[PDB]
Symmetry: D2
Subunit: 466 residues, 4 copies
Amino acid sequence: TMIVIFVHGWSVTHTNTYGELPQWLENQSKQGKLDIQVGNIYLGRYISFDDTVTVDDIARAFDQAVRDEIADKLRDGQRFACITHSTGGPIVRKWMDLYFKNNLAKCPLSHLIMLAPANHGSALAQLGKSRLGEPGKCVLDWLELGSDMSWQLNESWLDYDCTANGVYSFVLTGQKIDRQFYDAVNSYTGESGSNGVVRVAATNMNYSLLKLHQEGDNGESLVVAKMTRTQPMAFGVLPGLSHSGKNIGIIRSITMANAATHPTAIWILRCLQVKSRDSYNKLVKELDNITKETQKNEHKEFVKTLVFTREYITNRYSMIIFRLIDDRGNHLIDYDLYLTAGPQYSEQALPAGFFVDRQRNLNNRGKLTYFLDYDIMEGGINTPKMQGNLGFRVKAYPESSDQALAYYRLLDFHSSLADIHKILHPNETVMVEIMLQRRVDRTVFRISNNLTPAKISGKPTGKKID
Amino acid sequence: TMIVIFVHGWSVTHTNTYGELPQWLENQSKQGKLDIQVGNIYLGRYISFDDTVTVDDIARAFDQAVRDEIADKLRDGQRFACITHSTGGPIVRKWMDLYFKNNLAKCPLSHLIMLAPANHGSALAQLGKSRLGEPGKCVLDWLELGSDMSWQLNESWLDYDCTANGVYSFVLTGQKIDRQFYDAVNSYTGESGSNGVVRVAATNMNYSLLKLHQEGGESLVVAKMTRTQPMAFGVLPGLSHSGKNIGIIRSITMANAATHPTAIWILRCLQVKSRDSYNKLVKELDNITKETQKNEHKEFVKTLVFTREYITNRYSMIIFRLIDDRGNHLIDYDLYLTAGPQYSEQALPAGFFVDRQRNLNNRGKLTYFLDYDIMEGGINTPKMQGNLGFRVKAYPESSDQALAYYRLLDFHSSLADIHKILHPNETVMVEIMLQRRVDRTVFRISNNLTPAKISGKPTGKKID
Amino acid sequence: TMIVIFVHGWSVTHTNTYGELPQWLENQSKQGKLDIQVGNIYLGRYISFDDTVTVDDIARAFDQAVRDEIADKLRDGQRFACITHSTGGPIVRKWMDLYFKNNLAKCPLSHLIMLAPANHGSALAQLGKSRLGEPGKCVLDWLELGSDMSWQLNESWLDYDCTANGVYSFVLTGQKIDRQFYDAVNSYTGESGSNGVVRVAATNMNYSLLKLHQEGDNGESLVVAKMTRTQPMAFGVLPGLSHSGKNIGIIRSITMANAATHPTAIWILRCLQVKSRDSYNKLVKELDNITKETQKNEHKEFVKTLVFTREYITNRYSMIIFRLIDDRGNHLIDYDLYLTAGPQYSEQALPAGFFVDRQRNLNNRGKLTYFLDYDIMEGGINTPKMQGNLGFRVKAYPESSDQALAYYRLLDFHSSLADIHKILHPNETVMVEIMLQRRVDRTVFRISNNLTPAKISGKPTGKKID
Amino acid sequence: TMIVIFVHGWSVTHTNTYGELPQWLENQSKQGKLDIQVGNIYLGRYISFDDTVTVDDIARAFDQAVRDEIADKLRDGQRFACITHSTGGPIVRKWMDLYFKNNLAKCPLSHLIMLAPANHGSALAQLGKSRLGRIEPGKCVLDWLELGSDMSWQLNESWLDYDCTANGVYSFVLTGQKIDRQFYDAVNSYTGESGSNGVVRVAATNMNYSLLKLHQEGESLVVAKMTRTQPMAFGVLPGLSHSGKNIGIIRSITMANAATHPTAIWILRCLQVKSRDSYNKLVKELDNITKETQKNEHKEFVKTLVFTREYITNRYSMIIFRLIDDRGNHLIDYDLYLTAGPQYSEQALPAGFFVDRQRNLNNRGKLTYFLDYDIMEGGINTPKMQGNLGFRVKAYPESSDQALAYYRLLDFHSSLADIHKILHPNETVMVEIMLQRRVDRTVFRISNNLTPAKISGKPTGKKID
Ligand SMILES: NC(=S)c1ccc[n+]([C@@H]2O[C@H](COP(=O)([O-])OP(=O)(O)OC[C@H]3O[C@@H](n4cnc5c(N)ncnc54)[C@H](O)[C@@H]3O)[C@@H](O)[C@H]2O)c1
Ligand SMILES: NC(=S)c1ccc[n+]([C@@H]2O[C@H](COP(=O)([O-])OP(=O)(O)OC[C@H]3O[C@@H](n4cnc5c(N)ncnc54)[C@H](O)[C@@H]3O)[C@@H](O)[C@H]2O)c1
Ligand SMILES: NC(=S)c1ccc[n+]([C@@H]2O[C@H](COP(=O)([O-])OP(=O)(O)OC[C@H]3O[C@@H](n4cnc5c(N)ncnc54)[C@H](O)[C@@H]3O)[C@@H](O)[C@H]2O)c1
Ligand SMILES: NC(=S)c1ccc[n+]([C@@H]2O[C@H](COP(=O)([O-])OP(=O)(O)OC[C@H]3O[C@@H](n4cnc5c(N)ncnc54)[C@H](O)[C@@H]3O)[C@@H](O)[C@H]2O)c1
């Protein structure tokens, strides 16, 4: 039999954040659609408004909360399904990483259903505690785009295979703005490609990590590339749902009256009924078809008022998180990073409208997140004259011996959107780690058996050390 | 045969920084006291005035400078002695660590003679580029007391056995201030227990790392102390860091070298060829240290206007590193020394303190500089019972304050027995790991499906 | 007779910055078009790349340079015209302020011809020294949008009447981007409404200062408004001209061969020929006609390449510099500032596309600069449904007694874009000083003749002090 | 008739901070010692633990508090005496400055009795909010109390022009210099600083101070101008710390001990002052008590079961330096030297002259030195040292070759042997040094050679006017 545990998001102070979905699941079980005994549905509550509490702290506390309440039930063979919202996803994923990484088959969790999870962060976190209010400062450090902590967790997750270990994981999210909750001085709260809080691409656990490492001898720079990708995970963009709120909040808006027709309740029930690789994979495809339908139907939105009418265009988007490092363990903080396109990989040739947002992490200036319009990029680049080309160029500083005796050579990376080995996918994040060679001029240290003392020159030799 | 390589200190722009010692060593070899062929004495020069250059960079560049110039001689069997001054010591130790840590026996270096090395940092580094000029910011990051980089290098060196691998390493330093070069606005330039730039205790490669890990509703402490292998250590008389007057290497001339302590003892160090020869020199230099520090204990300087008395005892340096068991460096804490039968923070001997500095890049790094002779004399008395200890209060300190918090740590020790943590002329590294306590309220689950406000009230019980 | 002194801009290291215009003016005098003796055209050179040198320093040093070189000529009755570029404008205006503020009739300057002057700052200055390279840090503090120093100078200049004192002042600028010099990672270098460095609106010496002062006891918050405007100054937006460069730089591109047909050279000669109020006002109107013609003709720009075609739309823009203070001498650093529109003055009703940029000064967080599309604002607000309404709402924090015992009441200002008393004009900056009342609850200090000692409560009374 | 208003210090949360002194005064009045009607003794309470509230806010609120409670009594001729503790002194002085500066005769206050007031700041304020509550306080008040604060400078510069006595306002400062050694914070040694009561330095309580202006002209020359406050009664009472029921200057007063308590005794005297002649006699009496107290407390021996401590307390001076130039800048990059001896060397100060230095965190041109006056005087006023004492200021950049805008060194030569000295035991001296900002002529040149050329930054060696 199944236990269900609800886990909420950040800045929550009341378990009504779960709407009435717990009570509904209870009733569905009584109707034979789920095998949940009365008393096996649990509401989680964790503290998100304490500046001292870290995500590590919360994930450790969940392990304790589980043992304190259902240790007997787990010993008797029961496994639980977690239904998470917002930060709840990352926290449960961290708990899995802390206690079961190399051993998912013994994890007492059977289903992970993440609702609008901030798996690759929220652009709002950087706005900080004062403006955002409420949220705890340490959890905002995790949620900040480009966070070193989310990078570490998500790099660890590249190696996971939940499905093969009998753990069925799902991401469901929406991309509707509840336009009554638009903060006019913080336009992230209405950002296209988001639900007001998390970007669709930042919810998706289908992502890649691309490592580009600079090589070279005496002469010119070369680039070795390696891409690794997470295992497939169910991913669905459901229609008409925002992050929060009783109107169209992805979970907040569920009631006993509307649940039967509520996309979230409908698909959560399906997810929980998965018991096999075959059933999982059918739901993967079903949710992908729903995604395609949702995003076509919501592409254009017309909002009518007594005074004005607005048109809103919602395409599909990609998020790049760049990590700039060198081969001596430094994060690079002084650099220019270019996208390039066209037959000559020009920084001036990107399709007009490619850009939505950029943000640089406040704790690590080597972490830079770009948010791009995938459909505008693909349409403009995959033409005869543009040849499908897409690339990066990174210029780190100092750039030559004449400026400093330690310096970096420019890196160029040439790719394509015209084949299946591409680095951008709609509704996905890609993590890009660029490692430059730290070049040190031989003048940094010379020895000479001329014993006549002399002034020490800083003039470069023009030849780097090994 | 022997090759010699000179390696200078920070902010140097001219190889006259070496005085005339290279030419003197060349003459000593012709007289038969050394086996150095003409042309096998090398002057090292590196860039310490470039803000982009790191100690990692310089040590890597040393490897290339060596290969570029004497690769042939090293294949032909020759090994080299490095004579370093100031940061040159750490730099050569970093090179050894990058290229030979697990294989010192293959290291082409046979002798490491460090003159006034900033092995555990310089208090002046924090004063920073502008005030100190000139020096390069990244090297100052390394030299800053409590630096994460020097800690990492010196923690690595706990495992070295240079002598066992045929590498004979020596530290020589002085503790005389050149009083013509006192910066009245920056009194570190005349600090007792230093030569104006480096503290005697900060040069010594004889040091311990003491780990104190909190365990446990009752707080306990597990202590573990590890110590470097013995290295030759000599405090030479009448020598300051730099300058032609009494600079430890700068003042050496062809005329005075035969009477100059640095030249005399460097020649002895170079002649060491065996464990037995090495150990003889360890003892001799220790005797010279004891003699120097007694003779220089009281210094009288009289001018036409006034007469100053300067007292110089012997000193100990503590570098504290405060962390927790979840990978955090701790930044909000109070650290107490304690003494007396009750381990009171109010009972330290009067005059025990010289200095404290907190690292600007890592606030979990705190360096105390103490007068060992005042401490020992006040603590090892009948009424004080020899007690010395630490108390650390990290914040937040309780559930009601925050749902993640720390319990006080108390460590109780003694200066009365051989297992003591403080030694004269030594730095001690103290890593204290507290347990991060998280109250169970941080996460609860309930099968009461009736929604309700979430309370932050502590349970008073911590999670595993 | 006339002396001419050229004065360059920031980051300049070579007097070829002036093009060949000095040599050309020399020949126009020899042909009887100007009254400039041989040897009475001077090239100014000042140091813009020293981090210790201030705008105050440079204006003081200009005075010394003039006395060192032409004191005798000035004693004999000669006066000089300054032709300035970029920062040179602000610098000569500071010199006028330091030495002749209350006394412009004694000023030895007869004409001030400012070419693309950064009179209200440059958005690029905040990007700082490293990224911009070169430029001196203290001059960048002046040029920064919202700078306290430029505010002080320009508030002083509200009281000037150059024309009445026989000083003929002119601003000429362009709004063409030299698209060869677009920095892809810093899009200010191609900002619509700018020449790549200075926004048209930031060059204009026709501007207003609007003071909004909050009044009211307990009960109702009310606002007293006072607007002051500079005297009219000649202002022209010339066609086809960018900030810099030999291609189309407003002064750099002038050669002996093209000068006769070069807009800058042609209109400089007209300005130098002004000798009276009547000729000045004639030129004011002629240049306004040129501005209207330029901005219609350049409204749409099509750039064709072998690979793609770009369309660029340039309207007319307004810049607002907000200064937030209170009645006790504090700059406010914690506030939300809203534009409002529609019949209900809603922050949600602004015309779509109204916004170009916002910047907050790094030295004074009470200084906030918005850059707006005037033509989109006007077209959307001046409709039957929108009634012409435009307003401000300022929410400063803390906002109530319950949050802090010293707090601020919200301020609302209601205006119109349909009257001649409007606060926005195309191609103009408006300075908006908002002064809020600092409310202090009576609990901050009480006295009682009950001598029984008791704990001190911080509970607000709900009544403020006088 | 007299009204008495009690005003407390910072971080206070309970009106027992006043000890039993208000009740004792009431009892004293019921016996004829004072003419205070029953009901005319008021306890003041203000908020010091709110980060948004400033000293300006508190002084404004004091005015409202007074009008709200005793407006009728003041309209009918009554005037009040303020008995203040710690920050209460500066607060009441700010209220006087806001509402009565050039009109003290109309001020309803008749007596200002300041107990251990932080008139020139507290060294502890820089330690900030988190650290101080562990030894709570509102950040904006700490900005006022910080040594070298721009706000205290402004109030105390304004007070140079006051003459309370001439306007019928009788002002007094009483303080102590005893450490309550049970409340020593081992990691923050300011809490036991010699020359202080654990919170405020005696020299920082004193309203007898000077402002010395040194303006550079020009070789460099220096014009000096010293202005001094009017005499104010100043007494250092024996055996009294800042706070605590043990020996706290006001906290330790009880009905039982008040008759023998130095604070109650001398407060009563101060309140009874009704004339210039009575005031001046009290000034001299209090100065005698100061000399006695500081002689009797010069040496303190503290004995325990484990050890014995000797503590030496001399008399101290505090210098607050303010470095500016003639163009409105505060200087942030400089070296400041004291100098002594026949050649005004920075190496010739008497050994032990120094206690403390602190630089303001909001204005790096504000530097506070705390010096041992008795050590300074004894070492400088000798035949070989000639009584010399001076300042040298080296601001940066210091030459054309370093920067085209730069400063020339300033040297000021003075003496501790004459009556016009700048240092006084138990006093603060504010020193404003204004340097000439020198700008090399290369910063702007004009030339009628129309051949374009590179712009040289080489300095000319001649400055602009
Ligand atoms: N603020 C939102 S929702 C937003 C939207 C899109 C991109 N970004 C990026 O996210 C990062 C941080 O955004 P940001 O801090 O808003 O940056 P931004 O550069 O827009 O603003 C800088 C500062 O000015 C403040 N400010 C701006 N406008 C107002 C206003 N009307 N009233 C009051 N204060 C104002 C703002 O709160 C912040 O402290 C930057 O990289 C932005 O480019 C932010
Ligand atoms: N400066 C030296 S040599 C010194 C000596 C002993 C201990 N320490 C410790 O080292 C750390 C840094 O020293 P610090 O920055 O000098 O600290 P300190 O607190 O003494 O000085 C604070 C600031 O004021 C400046 N300042 C102080 N006196 C003067 C003066 N006479 N002229 C100009 N500026 C002045 C000083 O340069 C610094 O920027 C602190 O932890 C000190 O306690 C420093
Ligand atoms: N930078 C230009 S030209 C620009 C354009 C429009 C508005 N603004 C506003 O001006 C202010 C300062 O702009 P900003 O500092 O660029 O803020 P922004 O929020 O765009 O960038 C934050 C930081 O990220 C850095 N960064 C962003 N993208 C890249 C990249 N591709 N390569 C390297 N570093 C990158 C950038 O240099 C800065 O240090 C903010 O208020 C912006 O919203 C700037
Ligand atoms: N702290 C006191 S009471 C004190 C005494 C005399 C002079 N001063 C001057 O006042 C200014 C500020 O003093 P400061 O912040 O103490 O400067 P200091 O330079 O002594 O300390 C630097 C930093 O290290 C911290 N620190 C030092 N010792 C310990 C310890 N045992 N446990 C935990 N943390 C420690 C201290 O809190 C501070 O954040 C400086 O100019 C000092 O020289 C302070």
